[PDB]
Design a protein around this nucleic acid. Structure first.
Lengths: 79, 97, 108, 93, 93, 103, 78, 97
DNA sequence: CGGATGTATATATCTGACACGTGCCTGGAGACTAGGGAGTAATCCCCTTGGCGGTTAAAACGCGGGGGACAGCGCGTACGTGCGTTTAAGCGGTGCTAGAGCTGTCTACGACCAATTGAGCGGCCTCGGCACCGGGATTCTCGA
DNA sequence: TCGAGAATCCCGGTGCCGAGGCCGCTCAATTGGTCGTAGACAGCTCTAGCACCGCTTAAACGCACGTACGCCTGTCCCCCGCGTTTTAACCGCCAAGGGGATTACTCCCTAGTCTCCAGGCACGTGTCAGATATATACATCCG
């Protein structure tokens, strides 16, 4: 457990730089930790449901592309 | 002891991470984080490697878009630094929360 | 008996009319599938693919490289204002973000 | 071993027909395949919706011609419908 | 020339829940639209999911998964419980 | 005799089965699928009407107006997530005043 | 002039439904422009549907379907 | 007479038009606008009245949402007055254009 | 709080949408069949998990400092609002014609199956476009 | 401005492994017909969207006056940049197992056809829930 902090402060720094952010606050790290957790829960919820319906115990890439497609954030290049 | 003016390393290192394609998050921390989150919904679940790479490469573009919106909102307030309140505002206007 | 002649060549198309016809048959879209609908869909698909490939090839050739990779395709999708509107929701794996920087953030 | 289907030898012909001296990588080939599959799904689903909505049971060329004018934004739809009409009228002969 | 409606069917549920309460025709039309919307939201999702698994039958399982996907947690639990109750009342009857 | 009654439901099972057959969702529809879907629709409708009745009792009116539907659907944290994007015709807006607007 | 029919007090009350305190004088042209854009975007799809139907009228069903495509589906018209 | 302090009249207006279920916009001007914008694509567009009413409902709702997001953005900027830049911000984060 | 207004509250009278017989036809429910989709059975091996160890770029910690977020003054200027007025929007009739909507042919068009075979996919080398890097020429940068 | 210094681009070299071309080799795409039927078409109806005149009047508009607040001055503090110290990601290579794709065989369950029957919605009645107008306390602003 406690792997949410595994997304390290330099990782959020690099993501902000790629986005185009010049200066970084202090609590935005924690807020990014929170929003990432919420988004991953909301995607993993659907991915695991899709896997469970198929009666298998391995989540394939296609059954995650489907979950992202449902949310409107479709992903190309897998499946 | 040459020291870059505060902001020089910000106008730099912003070129590197925009011109190139990468992941900007280590493989294994994200893998174990995904395992931790997925453990709650179903016990003893197996993830295909491609099914973790897809999750990561689809969760990077969400954070990048959220940070771009946060930056725009912070610019609106006649500022440069981004506050957390900018992040809640970005999510609220986006309608996600 | 007439010699075999593929339907893609009959209409001068580079995508298959037959495979699209089969997909529309067994895809559970309609009870019956028309005759010109598959060839029309193949034409639309090949035109869209040709445009998105031509833009990507031009961008890659600008980058002094011959291979087409997801980076140059990401640039092609996000550059033209029409494909950007068509692919607004799509994310491309290993695509990156187009190089932009805000004017306010510029030095001085 | 049981054939999967992919538009590989089908996008190779278009790329070589538009850029006789350009090549495509496997990952970009996978992106292109997923893009063509997605556009096919969108357009066919829209044509099916039109057929159901207008209380018809067959998707002719008209339904796909209408669906393109909705799905494709900008001046792209004009060229797409023009070339579709060109292809179908050459196929009729 | 007949149009299908859901007025009486919503009315029975209303009477079973809140007696002496009436619905204006606009609200009945709104509820009819709501039912016709959720019906499509579930049926289309079940169809796509069944077609995504090389299966050609929409049984109770695909809809149950579709219900689990299309609803929030504390509502999905109750909806799935109601579905199982109805089906189990039906498989025995 | 009506499958709607042997299953103890209120919504049709025959209408749902017929629509699933001509909806062209699949070539073959299961036997428990229509009853399951009818039960789910009936539960959602019962919840919505219960909320609307509560709103009508709040407004001291015996009839339910589309505005009551708007209030009921906007006043809940879980049915809002299901109907956030949609707009009720001839409805209204939830009474909302920002904190900074207050003197 | 047809667009300027939606005048300043109408936009003011719309903003009051939005729950605002003070409104600037430059909002009106921008609001008219954005409403123009949204209305033309919806009408193009509605007219496309009517042309598919081989009819010369725009029924409410066509408008609600055009909104349905826009991701802003509307209850209360069938 | 009494001269209201700016703001109290605004809130008196808010709390009475929140309860309003009406359309706030005049029917004939909006109908004329709809007909004019329709004439561009095709001519002889006979509009059914229910279609115009539905379009009016949809446009009203969209404008209300846009002004709500604009209000949020304006309050962010330590301001209480709406500006067109706040509308541009809202229509950028919502990604409508 | 002296005084003043548009704020709910109780009452009469519409009155027109909502609530209720009905019927009949029109779609749902039994009755029965049969053939192809799916569950069950076996298997096997491709893919997934678990693990050890050497390697080092990345994460963490720590401190100097400097530029920005923020607290505050004011001012004039753009936005509330009171009011006349005047301007055009709903009502409510009038006329009515163009177009949606419902039937009756019957024909051109699409599903289906029996032969028939070439295009497209699985597999196998293979050479060159590009990855990695040494290093030199080249271009920003900020303390002066 | 300027000049040492810190990045940066690129020229050229080596190296590689993965697109790409080639070769089997099936089975899905072509013909050739029938066979039924969806809708293309014509026609007839009827209906509502459209045009218009006046009328009453609700509010849209322009003119003011007051004033709330959107927008430089100084400050301090918090985040950046670098220098040092880890340490866990990573890459490789191993070993072991398990469950996800395959076929094979039922077998049983839903599509399909038929005949019967009841219930669901337009088509007509009532009728009463709530709008609409009138008079009474008052929360809060002027000051």
């Amino acid at each position: 457990r406690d792997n949410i902090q595994g997304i390290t402060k330099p990782a959020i720094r690099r993501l902000a730089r790629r986005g185009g952010v010049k200066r970084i606050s202090g609590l935005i790290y924690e807020e990014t930790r929170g929003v990432l957790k919420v988004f991953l829960e909301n995607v993993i919820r659907d991915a695991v449901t899709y896997t469970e319906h198929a009666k298998r115990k391995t989540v394939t890439a296609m059954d995650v592309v489907y979950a992202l497609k449902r949310q409107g954030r479709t992903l190309y290049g897998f499946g | 002891p040459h020291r870059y003016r505060p902001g020089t390393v910000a106008l730099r290192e912003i070129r590197r991470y925009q011109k190139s394609t990468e992941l900007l998050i280590r493989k294994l921390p994200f893998q174990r984080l995904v395992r931790e989150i997925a453990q709650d919904f179903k016990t003893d679940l197996r993830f295909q490697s491609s099914a973790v790479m897809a999750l990561q490469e689809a969760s990077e573009a969400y954070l990048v878009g959220l940070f771009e919106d946060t930056n725009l909102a912070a610019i609106h307030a006649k500022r440069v630094t981004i506050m957390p309140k900018d992040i809640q505002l970005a999510r609220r206007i986006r309608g996600e929360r | 008996r007439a010699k075999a002649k593929t339907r893609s060549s009959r209409a001068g198309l580079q995508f298959p009319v037959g495979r699209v016809h089969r997909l529309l048959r067994k895809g559970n879209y309609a009870e019956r599938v028309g005759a010109g609908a598959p060839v029309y869909l193949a034409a639309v698909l090949e035109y869209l693919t040709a445009e998105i490939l031509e833009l990507a090839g031009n961008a890659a050739r600008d980058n002094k490289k011959t291979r087409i990779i997801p980076r140059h395709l990401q640039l092609a999708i996000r550059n033209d204002e029409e494909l950007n509107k068509l692919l607004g929701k799509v994310t491309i794996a290993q695509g990156g973000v187009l190089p932009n920087i805000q004017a306010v953030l510029l030095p001085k | 071993r049981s054939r999967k289907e992919s538009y590989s030898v089908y996008v190779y012909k278009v790329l070589k027909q538009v850029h006789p001296d350009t090549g495509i990588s496997s990952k970009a080939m996978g992106i292109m395949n997923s893009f063509v599959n997605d556009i096919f799904e969108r357009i066919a689903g829209e044509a099916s919706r039109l057929a159901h909505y207008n209380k018809r049971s067959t998707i002719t060329s008209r339904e796909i011609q209408t669906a393109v004018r909705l799905l494709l934004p900008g001046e792209l739809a004009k060229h797409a419908v023009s070339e579709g009409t060109k292809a179908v009228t050459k196929y009729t002969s």
